[PDB]
Structures are given as structure tokens and as C-alpha cells.
Symmetry: D2
Subunit: 494 residues, 4 copies
Amino acid sequence: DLPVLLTDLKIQYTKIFINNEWHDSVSGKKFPVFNPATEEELCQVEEGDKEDVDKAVKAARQAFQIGSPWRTMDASERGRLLYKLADLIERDRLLLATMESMNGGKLYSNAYLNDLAGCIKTLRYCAGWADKIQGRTIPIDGNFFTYTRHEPIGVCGQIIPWNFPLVMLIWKIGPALSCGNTVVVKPAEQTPLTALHVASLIKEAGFPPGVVNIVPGYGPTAGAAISSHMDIDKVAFTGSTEVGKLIKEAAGKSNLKRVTLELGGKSPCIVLADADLDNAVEFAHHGVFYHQGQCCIAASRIFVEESIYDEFVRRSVERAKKYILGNPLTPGVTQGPQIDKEQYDKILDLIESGKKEGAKLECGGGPWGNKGYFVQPTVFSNVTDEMRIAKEEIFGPVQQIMKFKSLDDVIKRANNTFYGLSAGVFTKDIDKAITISSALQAGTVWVNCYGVVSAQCPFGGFKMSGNGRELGEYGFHEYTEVKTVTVKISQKNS
Amino acid sequence: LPVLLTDLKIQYTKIFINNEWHDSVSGKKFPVFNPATEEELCQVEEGDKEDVDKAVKAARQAFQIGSPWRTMDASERGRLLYKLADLIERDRLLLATMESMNGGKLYSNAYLNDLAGCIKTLRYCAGWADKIQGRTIPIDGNFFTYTRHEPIGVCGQIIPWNFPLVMLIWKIGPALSCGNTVVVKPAEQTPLTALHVASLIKEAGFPPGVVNIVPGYGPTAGAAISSHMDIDKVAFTGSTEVGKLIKEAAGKSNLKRVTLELGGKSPCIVLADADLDNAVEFAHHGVFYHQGQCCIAASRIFVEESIYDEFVRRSVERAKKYILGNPLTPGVTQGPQIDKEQYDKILDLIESGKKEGAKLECGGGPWGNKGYFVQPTVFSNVTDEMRIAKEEIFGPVQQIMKFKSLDDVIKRANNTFYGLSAGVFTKDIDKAITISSALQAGTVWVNCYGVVSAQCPFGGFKMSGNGRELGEYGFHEYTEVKTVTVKISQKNS
Amino acid sequence: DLPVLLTDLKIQYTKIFINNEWHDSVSGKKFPVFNPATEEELCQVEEGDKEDVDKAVKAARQAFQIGSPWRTMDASERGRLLYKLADLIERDRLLLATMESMNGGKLYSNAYLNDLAGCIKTLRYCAGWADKIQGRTIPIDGNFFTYTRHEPIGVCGQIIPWNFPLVMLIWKIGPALSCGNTVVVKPAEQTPLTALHVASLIKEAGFPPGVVNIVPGYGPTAGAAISSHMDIDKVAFTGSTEVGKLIKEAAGKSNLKRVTLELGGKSPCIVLADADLDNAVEFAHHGVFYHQGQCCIAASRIFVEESIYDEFVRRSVERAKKYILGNPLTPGVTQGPQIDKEQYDKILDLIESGKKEGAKLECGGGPWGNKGYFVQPTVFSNVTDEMRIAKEEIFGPVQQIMKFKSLDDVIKRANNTFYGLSAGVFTKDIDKAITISSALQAGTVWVNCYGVVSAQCPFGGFKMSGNGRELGEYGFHEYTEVKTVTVKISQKNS
Amino acid sequence: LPVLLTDLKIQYTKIFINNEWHDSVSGKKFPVFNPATEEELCQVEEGDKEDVDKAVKAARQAFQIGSPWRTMDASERGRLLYKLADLIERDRLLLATMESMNGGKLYSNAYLNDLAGCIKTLRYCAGWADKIQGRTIPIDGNFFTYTRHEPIGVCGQIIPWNFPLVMLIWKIGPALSCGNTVVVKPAEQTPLTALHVASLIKEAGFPPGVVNIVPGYGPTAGAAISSHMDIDKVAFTGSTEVGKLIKEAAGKSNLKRVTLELGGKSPCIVLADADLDNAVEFAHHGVFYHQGQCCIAASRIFVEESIYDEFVRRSVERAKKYILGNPLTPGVTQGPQIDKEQYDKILDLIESGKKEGAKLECGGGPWGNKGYFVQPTVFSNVTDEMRIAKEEIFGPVQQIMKFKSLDDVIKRANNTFYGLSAGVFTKDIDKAITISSALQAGTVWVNCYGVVSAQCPFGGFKMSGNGRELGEYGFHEYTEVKTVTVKISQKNS
Ligand SMILES: CCN(CC)c1ccc2c(C)cc(=O)oc2c1
Ligand SMILES: CCN(CC)c1ccc2c(C)cc(=O)oc2c1
Ligand SMILES: CCN(CC)c1ccc2c(C)cc(=O)oc2c1
Ligand SMILES: CCN(CC)c1ccc2c(C)cc(=O)oc2c1
Ligand SMILES: [Cl-]
Ligand SMILES: [Cl-]
Ligand SMILES: [Cl-]
Ligand SMILES: [Cl-]
Ligand SMILES: [Yb+3]
Ligand SMILES: [Yb+3]
């Protein structure tokens, strides 16, 4: 099957990365990092806090100064540095996939084939934009010459989640750097290791010091310090809606820093009677169960037209019973662990609520073993809108299936949530596909597929699933600050 | 459907240059006719090379750096276009009546479709005038680079007889919104509505020389435009054959920019899963609208075998319900062809269909004692090598063909030098997307046909055209890009 | 030419406007509205509070529903409705200019010639965008058809200041409606009247009920209710940086509503020795003194190169002594009153601090007259960076003039502020104009002019002067929510 | 400046079709020369109509719906272009050496400028491949409308001899990034570097038929491209005279789309307040770079009266510092003209200057015993009616003229059928903006000259061109817009 690392993974990078150098935490404190499949400690990482964030921000600010190498180099050269970084990640693909799998509880085949490929491709996409970011010339009323500059914003604080550590790192730094910003990155406490390896590559690629700085640490300490910092121009955060609210609040209270948020969801699928049933079953399944359900876009409410509901459930249950739980580095394993005990506990609790509230348990419904954080793939049918499992983001391998008869009513039910990250629509009918996708209050709507994400398209939430968009052309806007320059002239001509 | 309460009086018949009326330099005039009755409506000044030359000088002068048209706010060019739209709206009854009478165009369509299209298109174009923007560009090196999307200059615009008013606006709207000046040559058959619009251009307050209108013939006035050494751009809508000559003359003269919207032989592909009545109705509309006199006519309808016989049957039933007569007469649902030359060409192609073994299902000859009426005609069992399957007919003549293989029918649909438009009829998402992607056609309609709007670009693939008109994209063709690159001591992102 | 209203202005619209009908406040309470030139009470206006906001939001939500007239009408028809509204405002231009002047303390000639013309032109500009808002088709990796929809966001709460009540009303509703949103508008407590007249014209134009709702009232009541409302999708606010922070905070705490802010400034001008001196004096003067200094963009720090400093001051003082203070409806008056007693007091307090801290008072420096809130046009020279008058936004007719010798240093001084709304650069040199304007941390930089604002160009702040941009092509983005639709297909072709 | 350590061995001399090397159909070959020495470097297969026909069939096949090139990810087209850039970088010494030897091009410029420009341009184009996007459009009525910016198809690309490698990349980069297939005809004088690049195109992994290269003459292979019935678009850089013939043949044949980058007679306007040394230096570079063999050559320098004499003085001093010889020889700063026909034409124009009374300040004749060397030549007191003021020289011949009235000199600068570029030298903001706005030129440089980059669009006004190359805007010309309009039951905003 796939290539593997022929030598044992040695963890080398564990410190705070500022000005292209490695730093101990100011306090001297360190924190442990674990393998969630085995509960073994992999290493200790420097514990960044407010004081470390402050150093990083000073370094990022200095690198952003007018006249600095990063501000004065050709846009095309920023692009070239990003392309070079992509090449380096490609070179270290085995190492990074192995590290990502070990630290993140992520199936190795997925880490190698999906995550690493996504990283490389996304970086290369971003590189291409650097010298194609353009302002406007504007035919303003009066005798004036008016143009706009789409400048970088400045120092961007970027807070990265644990579910796709490498991919999310690139999703953030790629556009930020392509646009000419400098960054202070705070990877998730659970998964700092791949980010720190990437930092070694950032130095190797030749980025000027201070352009990228990485501060491992906890949310309420390092993350909060970023969000309330008086010299950070922008914060980007991916994670829970609850923390998203606190970031936005702290931005308002501190220096009115710009904010982009990619938060939770409770994304619905609507499966019409005319759908290709196998395709719908398969995508809805993938949509819920990919990476042990640990995706913001998880297809966590599947609404199925009455006449095909029983068959849909049956095929979904068959598909869910085929998994082999274990160490994600082990060939033959097809489901890894949840990231940590807190997530594991929360998932089991929500599964209990489902049983208690009268959802029909079709398979799974409990833990698997004591070692690491494994949850049996679980399917609930006859789920109703008022159940906790129908309302709350689970972030685990738990599928909810519901029936509908009225299309108008099921669109209302799909939209009746504060969330709005994504949705899926399954039908062969042109008119239905277009009109349903238009009516759904979701940032991405998939038609006859699910979970198809690419660097070329903008991604983000409606309502409380997010503020702003990442990637594609549109996502680049959020890493620029627009300046209008209006020059008096003696006479204009069209 | 309001009507004109008074008899239409023809007032504007001369050459319009510098907001004034001129006789032709030669003194010659030409007659203009009502194609339904064959009566002569009036005589119009016959513009030729010398008249074109006067118009071009006027347009050039109005385009000079420092002139009112060059120095006014872009928003004010917009205001002028909006005002022109309001004036056309005010004169809607008059214009629809004139368009109907001169053009052989059903009054209800003239009033409800052509005039509305005109007004809406002008208002759309008006809105772009101060939203045309260049770029600032992060060039390598210590430089500040920007672009200006300037007007091109003097644009010669040659307009056809089938949609005289709409096509006039389709041309002048974007040209003027972008800040060009124009020299317009309306079709010999249908100059009258354009000359009325010229009176409104003056009333609206456009500076003199910004719009000039020179009626006359193609080989004289039209050729003079295309070979003129001080015209920066020519735009032409008409036959592919004349399109070729325009492009050639452009190359030979001063390398003027060229946009062309030419003929078609547009196919429809009707799959077995299609809503059959919807397909029959849109394919029917697609071929028979305005007596078949549309570049986009749905002139090859390919129908999957299993529904072919029923499709033909319903199409024939639909085609036998027309009432032929004067397009000003309420209850008439098919007018005349524009003139005797077209009429003759259409009857000749109908004859070729009979001769080459197509099945004549209805119609197939002329109608009546006066004017140029052709019976609505349906041919079935048409094959790809027949003249009626290859040549643009421009008459009320429908061709229906069968297919069994989707892959093969796409090849057949694409096997033409034309490529203006096409239609796809199916309920299936995948088929709709993949078929529309595979068709070599500038506009592809799905479960409809002939849906045109000012918001979307329109134009041909292959020999159906060069460039696009309208929408955001169409505006590009009326601008000339200038890059300005300024040395600076040091740049910052 | 200056036509006037031939009849006495009769105040007719004083109620809350919801669903194209006039409503009393839920509480029954009303508040007085004044003429700041005379201190006389013009009328009483219904005092909207949380409960009134709630009714307005329900109306706006209902009008935004999928399948509603506002959602299903042609984009071009939204545009037509906006153009029609512009025509109606043009029809009522005398009435509106008179009302704006009387209620706002705004010079009639400026109200009629500038504000009303700006309103009409802005609306017409926005109308033209309605059917030119476009998404993308995107050549995503894999066998997919991807497109985007630039949908309206939904219910937009819009909070308008008292300095340009009509112009700011249009600046907000024009783009919001052009994009297809519905709105709940809260005009300033001081100046609700012109907005309520515009509401009558919104109804007359034929906008569907609930598309535009207007709730007069106070900031901490009605304004706070908007900013914390759980069913408002977006809030836009123009006003003080202090309130801006509270809005952003409440957005974060409530439902993560999108936020745009246009806040204060302390905008600098930099006048080089090679500048056209009369032009620079005139524009810097206009920049500070326009509408009694009551502009967010006021040119409130003028830095002048040493060799021309004394002459600059002299000419500035001569220019400032030519005003005639009085009722802004009186022909010949060239300076009106400040909006209210609170502003008046604040301005006089800052003028006192200037004297006290050792700025040189060149002219003015105190109040004027027996009625209304008049402040003498005041010029301070020898201002230094640590003085209150150099740091705090004054919002009155108070000009600060300072000297510099080093261009590098003065750029630092210009940038050394949390503000960043705008700036001015005065020089004949190409290189200086480009490199200085690039270096300044300001949203709009004027070269050899000042205060040139148009609907065609984006406008907004860097740093704590704002979040986002208003108007131009770019400003429209902030009133759309991007939806990506990705459709599985059997095979794609380029 | 690294150099090639081994002797250059010429390996690729054949026609490149379907990633294979072909002999000419006729069997004929043509010689290729070193212009510095007149020695024959090799013989190259002489492509003609029949070879063009094979190449077009290969390109057409590679463009078919469902082919690898049509179906691959846009990002993968980009990757292939990036890989090609890496391979050119690997072979930089070889390519620079070959370009210098065959093109008479100074080695340092070949290595530092041409090769770097090639690599950077390709990398720029690569980045656009997956960023080419259409639109979704809020059309009136119950419809869903979107556009596809498709590749056009088979693009014939005719390349000049002055910048063989750079111009090759300028053409194929955007064409391929957009998804087209190409048939490339390099200049008869300079086919060798293109054929080496073809080997790299294969090595990079482009599918067969995506790029085809047919060496040969203009009136044979070039004319066959321009009149071919299955080529969708032709792009040509070269003389205005041939440009006209290409456009004419396009019109006569199949109405293929046309982009042209032609000659110029580009003016500079130097104001009294200019940084004089900067202006002298850039105007000098502008006219003398690559022995004056640039379409954008700054061939009319208008200088304000009060600084005219000094401008001339400094220009003459600058022109007298060259060392003429073999462009591979270290220390040489001026190479030969490309061939005898150019050499003769240049000397003839220099004679006309003397005859018509221009003041010869330096140079004015040939140099050396072998190869086509012309002394760097400066004329002052040039007037607008002289041949040297009107005709494109394409040699190291500088024309300097005086003006007093700015309004008048703008008219003089604009009084030409050409309009490729211009330069404006001033420190004044207002002058810089208003003069650049008033000039009828595609690129206007302010306080610099000849600053070209892949990020900015480039092309001519008037008879200096049709369309733009490079930048965002240049990509439009390698796409064909398709509007797809789908009927739906009800739309929502
Ligand atoms: C999940 C742990 N918690 C407690 C609510 C928090 C609280 C606040 C933050 C902030 C401001 C940033 C962060 O990254 O993580 C957090 C985490
Ligand atoms: C239809 C009559 N014919 C003869 C082919 C022509 C020939 C040439 C032209 C040209 C160049 C322009 C034109 O408008 O009409 C023509 C008409
Ligand atoms: C005028 C100052 N104050 C009172 C503290 C406030 C405070 C809060 C708001 C909010 C949230 C919205 C507003 O419109 O006005 C305010 C005004
Ligand atoms: C410059 C030599 N000549 C004149 C015979 C030509 C003539 C025509 C062409 C054409 C059509 C294409 C070409 O590439 O070169 C030519 C060169
Ligand atoms: Cl912009
Ligand atoms: Cl551009
Ligand atoms: Cl988008
Ligand atoms: Cl488009
Ligand atoms: Yb008769
Ligand atoms: Yb006080």
C-alpha cells in the first residue's frame, strides 16, 4: 500500500519559534504532548504564555515595518518563498504524515494522501496569488486621480485547531503571507508538533526573521493573549463557537482588531426520493465519520424523504458496522481515536442523551476498550429536532438520521439552527438542486456529494458558524486592508 | 397593450451628424417600405463614403482630449444614458409602432419585448459608466504600476434589420458608457427608429458628435466604415459572409479592432427524460420567433429516438395555429419577412428541403397576395448533409432530427462552422452540466431557449462571432487598456 | 443657484416606521428634538427602545424570507426602486435640505448643494450595482462544478450619526438594499427627522413592507438593543471609537453578528516645502472647519515643513478670521452652531486644555453669541504631540498646526496614534506623493486636496478608526454573504 | 556571470509534433546562422503548409473533450508550467548561450535578462491556471445564469527573432495556463532555442499535441497558420505590414481570433524639470537595448527647448562608449544586427537622415569585416517629416527633437499610426498624470523606460497592435466566454 517512514520518528522541534530562532518559554514551563491512540507521552513542548506572545508580536511588528525586507521585496518573491516552502513540505512528507498521525490520532493513509497533499496544494495555490493581488483605478467624480492599494493588514494572530493541524496551519499562513502580512501562530495544545517542524522549514526556505512566529501553549493563556493584544491587527480563529464569541468580544474590548472565525456546525443533508441512493448513503456516511467525526462540517443531521428512509437507514447501518478500531499507524485499522479524554467524554455523554431521549440506536453506542479514546461508530435513527443529538455539535462518530415528507418543511427544519457552516443536497433534479441550495442558510452547499473542500473555493460559515471566508479569491480579501489614494489633478480625461 | 392613438407621422429621414440633420452629399435618397403591405413609407437620405467621412470627423473631434465628452464625469455619461432611456420610454408607443410598421414585427412583441429590452439595456449600461475600473499592480521592481481602461475612440457600428432598435442600443449603450464616440449605420431596410432615437440623443443633451447616424447600403456606407483610416473599432451584426469582408477590410486598412455577431445554425438536444411540452414549446419559440429572423434561431432540433415521433407530432400541431397578416392587426400572430430577397432565399431553401428528401410536415410555401409571407414550415427526418441542416435560413422553417447516441449527437451538434447558441433539454443535473460544457456555443440554454439579457455576455464561438456583447465582459471590448508604470525610490507592499 | 422653501417647514413624520406603517413607541414615551442654532424644540419623536427594535427586526426578517417579494424580485428591480427613491429625494430636495439645516445646525447652502446632491448621487450609484453583483465559477480540483452566490446577508441593523444624517442614512441603506438585505435603522437622537421623511418616500417608491424599518431613539437603549439582538445578522455603526468598541463586544457576546465600524480620527496632513502653499492652506482649512469641525475625517493635525511653517500659519489665521456665525438658514451666515450642549462643552474644554498646555492661540478660543452652541473658529500653533488637542478628537472648529524638519520623523509622528481614518499629503513631487501616501497608516490618503469623498471609492479606517469599508465596489462586499455551491459531475472539461 | 564550460552542441533541429521529432514533409531544410560571424550553425527542417496541417491535427486531437489536457485539474496545468520553468532554469547556461549565438544577443543580457524573464513569466502564468474564473449573474427572470471562461482551442503563435525565448514564453505561457493547445512558428532566423524548449515540454510531461513547434519561413508556414480553417486563434508579434496580412487572412479564412503586437515609433517627452541624467539614461537604454531591435524602441525623443542642448550632449557622450563585437566575448557591449536585410534597411534609413538634414552627432555607418554591425548613431535636430522620424528603424539609431509647447508636442507624439509605448520624464505630479493620460500608447512609462513585467498587460494602441498580452487582462484573450442559462421554478437573491 502507501510509503512509510523507514526510520523511527525522532521529535526534534519543541520550542517557541520567534525571529527564526528557537526560544524557551519565559516561565521555563513545558507541557506534555500525547499519542491519543496509546496515551503515551511523545515529548514536552515549551509552554508559551502572554510574555512569549509579546515577544512574538514585537518580532512580527518589526518584520512588518515600512522599509523592511518583507515589505519591500517583490510580491512575486513572497510567492516564490511560499512555493519553496511547499517543496520542503513535500520533501518531508513521510515524516510529517507520520508525526501528524501519531500526535493527532489520524489514520496514516489519510494523513499522507489527504492532509499532506492538501497542505502542499493549498500553499502552492496561495503562492500563485501573491503578485496577482490588485487594487483599482476609479473614475471618481471631479478632477481627481483615484486608486486603491490592497495592502497587508499587519500582524495577524492565528489560532489553529487540533483536528487538521497541518492543513489548518497552511490555510491560515498561506493567504496571510501571500498578502504580505506577518503572523503569530498558536497551534492547538494537543497538536503543536507538525507546526514546529514547519517552522524549521520556514527558516530553511529563507523567510525573513519575524515574518512567521509560532507560540505553542494553551487557549486561555496564549490564545487569550493574542486576542486581547494591543499591537495585533487581526485575529483568525478556528474552533468552537463558544470560544469564537470570546475572541470577538476580546477584539472589541482591546484594539478593535479585525476578526475572522470558522466555528462549529450542525450541518444538514437533505436526501430526496429521486437521489442516487448509494451515492447519498456513501457521502453522508463519509460526511459524518471522516476523521472520527472530528470535522466542523460533519453531516450531523441527515433528513431523508419518507419513501426511501428505511432503506437509507439500513444501508447506513451496514456501512457503519465495517470499521476496525485501533492505532492509526497500524495497517488494516480504519478508525482511529478521538483526540483526548475531554472530547471522548463529551461524545459518550451525547450518545447517552440520545438513548435517554428516545432516538433509536441502530449500532454502536459505547466505548471500545480502555486504552486511548475510542468510540464505536454509532448510528441513531428516528431522531427528532428537539433532541440534544439533533441540536448540539457532537464532534464524534455519531450519525443522526431523520425522516421528512414535506420539502418546504424540511428546509425550515434544516435552517432552524444558529449554525450554518455547510449542507448537502441529494437529488437528480436540476430545479430541486438549484432552488434547495439557494434556500439553505449555509456557507458551502454540496450537491450529490459532501465534504468537498479545495483551495480554489471560499469556505466559511453563515450565522454563528463563522465570520468571513477562507481561501479562494474571496478569502484573500480578509488579509488585506484597503487604502484609497485620491490625487488632485488639473483636468481628467476618460 | 396600449396603442398609438394618432397616425404615425414620419419626421426623421436624414443623416444625423453633430446633433444636426444633413442631406446626403450626393443628393440621393432611398425608399423604405412596409413589408406587410409593400407600400413605401418614405424616402431616406442615402449615405455613402462622403457622408461617413463627415460623421467620422465629427466623432473624432468629440473624442479629443479636453472635449466635454472626454472631461465629463463618468457618472454624467451614465446620467445621459439613463435620460435617453426615459425618453425612449416616453416615446414607447411611437417607437413600437414605427418598429412594427417598418420591420414587419408583431406589434405586441415590438412594444413588450423590443422596447422593454431597449430601455432596460440602456439603464443597465448607464449603471456601468462610473464602475469601469482599472487595476493597481504589484509589479517586480521599484515601480508604481496602474492601468486605465480608456475608451477606444471612434467606433463604427453596423446594425441589422431584424431587431433595429434593440441592436442599436446593444451597440451604443456599452460604447457610450465606456466613453467612446460612435458612427452608426442602420440597416437599409430599417433606418427609421434609429433616426428617431437620434432626435432623443440630442434632446437628452449628449454633446455634438458623440453619436452620428448614417443611413445607407452595406457595400457603400458599411464598407466605408470598415475601411476607414480614422475609425478605431468596427462592430457588426449580420451575416457571416459580410463579417468576413469586414474583418478583411479592417486588416487591409488600419487594423481597427473588430467585434462580430454573425449567423448561426444553433442546435437543440432533447433527451428522453425532458419535460416534453416545455421542450416543444421552447424549441418552437426558438425557431419561429419574429418569423424565424433571429441569428440564434433553433434551426436544428435533435430529439432522442424514443420521443422523436411524439415531439414531431406536437411540434406540427403547434406550428399550424398561426394567423398570418399585418403585424399591427390584433389577432395576427405571424408577420411578413423583411423583404423580397429574404423571402426568395427562404422559399429556395424550403425547395431544397423537398428536393433533398426531408419530410415536409406542414407549410412549405408562400401565403397571400401582398407582402412577403411564408407559411410556417416544419421538416422532419432531416439529415446532416441537407442544405436546410447546414445553411442559415432566417425564416419560419423548423428542422427536426433524431438521435440515439448522446456522444454522437454532441459531435453532430458541434459539426458546423457556426457556434452562436444551443439548447439542452433534460431534467438530469449531470447531463445538463456535461452537455452544456461540451457544446461549442456562446450561449447554452437549459430547459429554455432564447433567453437573452443585458446582464449576460452574448456572442459566438467559431464563425458565429468574434468577441462578446453586454454583461460585464462585453464592456471590455469598448475599452483600450493603458498601463502606466512610474519609477519610485522604494516600494512597500 | 440657491432655491429655498417658499412655505414654512411643517414637521409631519415623527413616528417609528415598521412594515411601511407608522407606530407609536411601545412605552408611549416621546423625546424632544431641537434646533441647535436657536435652542427651540421642533417637535417630539416616538422614543424607540428594545421592544420597538424587536418589532422592527421581526418585520425585516419576514421581508427577507425565501419566496418573499424582496427576495424573488429581479436584482434590476431592486435597482429601479433605489433609482425611484433618488428621484423622490430630488423632488423633495428643498424640504429635506431645510429640515436637515434646521435640525442639524447645518449651513443651508451646504445642505442643499452638498448633502442632498451627495444623497441623490450615492443612491443612484448604488442602484446601478444591484444587478452587477456577481459570484464566480471556479475550476476546483476534481470532477466538480463549483460556483458561488453573493447573497444578501439578511437583517442589517444600521446606526447613523448626527453630523451627516441624510448622507449617512443613504451610505448605509443604499448598498444594503442594492445587495438585497433588509434593514433596521436607528438614526441619531439629535437628528431623526430627515430619516423619517425618507421613510415616507421609501413607502411611496414601492419598497415591500419590512425592507426598511426606522426606529428613532437613544444609543444605550435602541442602539444597544440592535447590537445585542439575536436575530440581526449584521450591524453597521458610524460614531465614536468608544461606542464602536461596545458594539463589537456586544456582537461577540450575542450572536456573532457581522460588524462594520466607521469611527473617529485624528487625521494628519503633511505639507512639504515644495507644496502649492495657497492650495495646502485652503484644503487644510476646509478639512478642519467644514460643518463646524464635525467630521470624522477632520484634518486635526497639520504638520508643516519648518521653512514654510510661519507663512502657513499666517495664511491659515487670515483664512479663519473671515467667518460669520449665526443661524444656518440665514443668507450670509458661513458658520453654524455645534449640534448640542454636550459637544459644545467638550470643545470648549479641549480649547481650554490647549491654552493651559502652552499651545499658541492664534485666533478664536471661546464661545460666541447669546443663543445656540456657537464656538469661534480657533487656530492653535506650536502644537506638540503630547498635548490633549494633538491626541483627542475635538469635533469642533479647532485647527492644530505643528512644524517638522525630518520627513522620516514626521511620518512616524503622523502614524503614532490608534486612529487611522485619513490623511493628507501636500507636495508637487511624484516620488514623495507616492512613497508618503504608501507609508501613512490611513484608509484614505488625499494628495494636494482634502476631504474628497465619493460614492465610487471605498472609505473606512485603519486601526481603531474602523473595521471594513463603505461604498465603491469594495464596500459592497460587506453587504453580501458568500455561498459556495459544489456539484458532483461525471467528468469536467476546461 | 557563469558560462557554459563545454562547447554548445546543437541537438534539436526538427519539427516537434505530438511530442515527437519529425522531418519536414518536403524533405527540405534551411540554414541557421550566427549573425556575429556569418557562420552556418546547422540546418533545420523547413516546415510548410503540410507540416502545419499535421501540427494542427495533433493540437486539435489534444484539445478534444475528454482528453487528458481538457480533463486535468487547472492546478495541474499550472504545475506543468512551473515544472517547465524549473527545467529552463536547469538549462539556463545552455539556453542563454544558444540564444546569444543564434540571436546576436549579448550573453550577459541573454543570461541575466532573457532567461530570467522567461522563468519568471512562466511561473507567473502557472499561478493563474486555477484562478481563471467565470461569473454567476443575477439575470432578470426565473433563471440561473453562469459563465465559463473556456480555452479557445487551437492557437497558432508566430514568434519574432529579437526575443525568441521570451516571446515564446509570452505566447505559450498564457495560452497553456488557460487550457489551449498551440502550434508555434518561431522566426526563420532563430528556431533553435524554441526547439530546445520543446524537448523540455516533453520532459515536463505535457500531453502529446498540447505544444507543437513548426520552424520555417513567414510566407509559407506563417501564412499557412493564418489561413488555416481549423486554427481558432492566431497571435503574431512582428512588423505592422505582416500584421495586416495576418488579420486579412483571418477574415478570409475562418474568422479566427487575432492578437497582434506590432511595430512602434514610441515617443518620449522630457520636460524641463526632469531629472536629466535619469532621462538621458533611460531614453538611451530605450533606443539602444539589443542593438535597437525592440518594438518599444524610444525612437522619438522630444526635449523641452531649455534643456535640449544639454540633453543631446549627454546623449552623445553616452552613445560613444560601446565596444562592438561577438556577443559571446567578454567585454563586448554591442552585438550585431540579426541579418543582412535588417542591416541594409538600417543603413538606408541612416543615409536618409543625413540626406534630409538631420544633424549627425555620432556614428552613422557600418563597423567591422564580418557580421552585421552598425555604429551607434545619434541624430539631433530631427523634424517630424523626416523618414527617421516616421519609420521604424529597428537599429541603434536615436532621434532627438525639441519642443516648446507641451500641448503641441503631445499632438506631435500622437501624430502617428503607431502607439505601442511612450515615456514621460518630469518630477511634477500633475504633468505626469495628465500627459500619460493624453498619450495614445499602450504602455506609458514615467521617469523610466522599457520596464516590462509579466504582472502588467502589454500591447499597442492603433496600428501597433490588437489586444494585450500578460497580466490579468492578457489572459482574457486566451479564453472564450460561454454563458449558460438554466430555467428554474423560482429564484431568490
Ligand atoms: C476552551 C477553553 N477556554 C475556556 C472558555 C478558552 C477561553 C478563551 C480562549 C481564547 C480567548 C482564545 C483561545 O485560543 O482559547 C480560549 C479558550
Ligand atoms: C450584402 C451585400 N454585400 C455583398 C456581399 C456587402 C458587402 C460588403 C459589406 C461591408 C464591408 C459592410 C457592410 O455593412 O455591408 C456589406 C455588404
Ligand atoms: C453614548 C455613550 N453610550 C452610553 C455608555 C452608549 C453606549 C452603548 C451604545 C451602543 C451599544 C449602541 C449605540 O448606538 O449607542 C451607544 C451609546
Ligand atoms: C515578411 C515576409 N512576408 C512578405 C512575403 C510575409 C508575408 C505574409 C506572412 C504571413 C501571412 C505570416 C507570417 O508569419 O509571415 C509572413 C511574411
Ligand atoms: Cl478597491
Ligand atoms: Cl488591467
Ligand atoms: Cl466568490
Ligand atoms: Cl463573464
Ligand atoms: Yb403590389
Ligand atoms: Yb473646564
